[PDB]
Design a protein around this ligand. Structure first.
Ligand SMILES: [Mg+2]
Ligand SMILES: [Mg+2]
Ligand SMILES: [Mg+2]
Ligand SMILES: [Mg+2]
Ligand SMILES: [Mg+2]
Ligand SMILES: [Mg+2]
Ligand SMILES: [Mg+2]
Ligand SMILES: [Mg+2]
Lengths: 131, 107, 62, 49, 49
RNA sequence: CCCAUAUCCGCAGCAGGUCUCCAAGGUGAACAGCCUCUGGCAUGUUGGAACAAUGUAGGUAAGGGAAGUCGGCAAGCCGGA
RNA sequence: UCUGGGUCGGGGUUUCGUACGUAGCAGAGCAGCUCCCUCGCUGCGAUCUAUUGAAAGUCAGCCCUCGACACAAGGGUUUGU
């Protein structure tokens, strides 16, 4: 088995990551993070791996005024990969999933951080490259 | 004995470190004077006017890093002064500073 | 413990140093320090850069 | 020595070191030894005098 | 001063099990201490004089 | 004789106020801003030594990008041709 | 004190990125000299190349010196069961 170590989160609530699968969404505007208890005035932030409630801001109209669960799969903020390796991506990205983890889309474009290739196996099976 | 002359080099870019821009050249001259009062054992040192023209050559805030300096104790003959000896701090022009040590200077 | 080469300067990254960079086309680069990666992200060629390994083999400086 | 009785699994871990870094901490060091840096850089100008 | 090390972890059931992690260490320099005195304490109702 | 960051009014050698004449070189569209020459001055009623908190004035900042706040206040962005 | 610690110097480290001079049948081209040349040889010329991982800095709160040069039992004020 194994549990997720904490990483540098660096992706707060008001962020707009771009959607990285073939569901027709172009953005994912994060609105909260699942798992945060929070402290007074601290904003909920997410890293790679974290499941996230997000709404899409542009894209196909049957996706737009709803709240979808999503998983961040790439982050631009550097995090430490525990073999002393700091790793970061060109962009912040995520895929739309349901509460169980199956994707609404079917294929992920771009690489996928291996921290969410271990937590989310149905994401990891549609990834072209595991960075 | 008491009258002697030596040539020194003075690392100015370690005594001016961290002092503000408009005080670097004035502080340099009160580091020359403090270097000489410890090196020769005398108060009343006197800086030659071409020595501070040297330290002011690049303005108030860019001071030379090193300057070659000739110290000289002299018997204070112009008056019955409380300081029997004074120190003259004339300037030595030099191209490089590599491999220069403190040297005793003849008359 | 695998010793890996800097994608810009051709030097030798040891396992506590530098940072990796995954560009979103599949390519993974390694950088020795922030001097190397800011030179990389500003798109300049390491063969015009006098202190890199690729310069010193283009000009045969060894 | 500690005041407690160490019973956790992390407290009783036998360790075995594999590499110790010796890069210069006075800047971004690149070279673990002196003989490595000289064998990589080559003969400089100030040696051949 | 501080440096950093590489070692292989034996935590059965963990994510870093049988893998290489980088740990940050602290060097503490310890020459041998010289014993020059003995002092004895007695138990008292006011402590330990 | 002064004609004004000291000769005038403002209780004062008071950052205020108070009508005009002459007007160099460079940059540039330009009596713009910046740097210099003629002429003028000694930093504006004290120096010295330090580089703590808090200020006042100025800067920069990973990753997000108004989520702050009554309110994008402040700053930033934009800029010429 | 088996001295000592200072000031320079040297070495190590590291930062930036290859100094000035000089050389080049390197150079977009242009101007010249014609008994020349048998396609020359003087110039101007951003830049390039060699000398050159050079040059410059580096404890002031970096490291190691034993090289040089000085200086260090000197002062001042108080303290008794
Ligand atoms: Mg350091
Ligand atoms: Mg006044
Ligand atoms: Mg002032
Ligand atoms: Mg004054
Ligand atoms: Mg920022
Ligand atoms: Mg609001
Ligand atoms: Mg609020
Ligand atoms: Mg405003």
């Amino acid at each position: 088995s194994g549990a997720k170590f904490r990483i540098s989160l660096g992706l707060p609530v008001g962020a707009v990551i771009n959607c990285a699968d073939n569901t027709g969404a172009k953005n994912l505007y994060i609105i909260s993070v699942k798992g945060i208890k929070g402290r007074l005035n601290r904003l909920p932030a997410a890293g790679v791996g974290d499941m996230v409630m997000a709404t899409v801001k542009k894209g196909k109209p049957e996706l737009r005024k709803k709240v979808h669960p999503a998983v961040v799969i790439r982050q631009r903020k550097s995090y430490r990969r525990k073999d002393g390796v700091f790793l970061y991506f060109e962009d912040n990205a995520g895929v739309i999933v349901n509460n169980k983890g199956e994707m609404k889309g079917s294929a992920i474009t771009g690489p996928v951080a291996k921290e969410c290739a271990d937590l989310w196996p149905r994401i990891a099976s549609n990834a072209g490259s595991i960075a | 004995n008491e009258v002697v002359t030596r040539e020194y080099t003075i690392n100015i870019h370690k005594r001016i470190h961290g002092v503000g821009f408009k005080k670097r050249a004035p502080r340099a001259l009160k580091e020359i004077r403090k270097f000489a009062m410890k090196e020769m054992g005398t108060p009343d040192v006197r800086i030659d006017t071409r020595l501070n023209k040297a330290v002011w050559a690049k303005g108030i805030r860019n001071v030379p890093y090193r300057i070659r300096v000739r110290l000289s104790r002299k018997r204070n003959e112009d008056e019955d002064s409380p300081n029997k000896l004074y120190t003259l701090v004339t300037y030595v022009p030099v191209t490089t500073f590599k491999n220069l040590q403190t040297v005793n200077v003849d008359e | 413990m695998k010793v890996e080469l800097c994608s810009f300067s051709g030097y030798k990254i040891y396992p506590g140093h530098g940072r990796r960079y995954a560009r979103t086309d599949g390519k993974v680069f390694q950088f020795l320090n922030a001097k190397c990666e800011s030179a990389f992200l500003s798109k300049r060629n390491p063969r015009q850069i006098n202190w890199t390994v690729l310069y010193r083999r283009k000009h045969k400086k060894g | 020595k500690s005041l407690l009785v160490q019973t956790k699994r992390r407290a009783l871990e036998k360790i075995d070191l594999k590499f110790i870094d010796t890069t210069s901490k006075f800047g971004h060091g690149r070279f673990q030894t002196m003989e490595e840096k000289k064998a990589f850089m080559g003969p400089l100008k100030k040696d051949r005098i | 001063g501080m440096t950093h090390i590489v070692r292989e972890v034996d935590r059965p059931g963990s994510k870093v099990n049988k893998k290489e992690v980088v740990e940050a260490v602290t060097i503490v320099e310890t020459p041998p201490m010289v014993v020059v005195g003995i002092v004895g304490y007695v138990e008292t109702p006011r402590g330990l004089r």
